[PDB]
Amino acid sequence: TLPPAWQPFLKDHRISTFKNWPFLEGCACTPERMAEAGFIHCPTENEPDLAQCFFCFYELEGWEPDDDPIEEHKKWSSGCAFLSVKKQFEELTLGEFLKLDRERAKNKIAKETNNKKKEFEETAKKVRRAIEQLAA
């Protein structure tokens, strides 16, 4: 088979992640169409409909019945390389696959860096305000 870390490349696996997805039959953003777009379901108490791309790790919420997951992706973050692969997974060469997976590993790092950066700016804002308050 294929080891877990690589399962997200499998459409059927992505589909599987949508448990209690509200947008079903009749909707443009079905679990099938979401998966075809590269999304997996990453629900939180806070954001129950939160989906994330497995490749570029971009995250979208506030989904609506008529949303085309593909056009949503292309619109909010076009740079994602998964979008550009029209080949079927198993028609891919191992070189092509490992190439992609390299870029995913890259994207992942980028994602984590941007996150560290955001919480840095957040704690900064807090020390700043505290300092201001004391100054008063």
């Binding site: 953003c29 939160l50 995250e59 979208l60 919420e61 949503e72």
Partner: peptide, 4 residues
């Protein structure tokens, strides 16, 4: 949809 929209970013978070």
């Amino acid at each position: 949809a929209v970013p978070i």
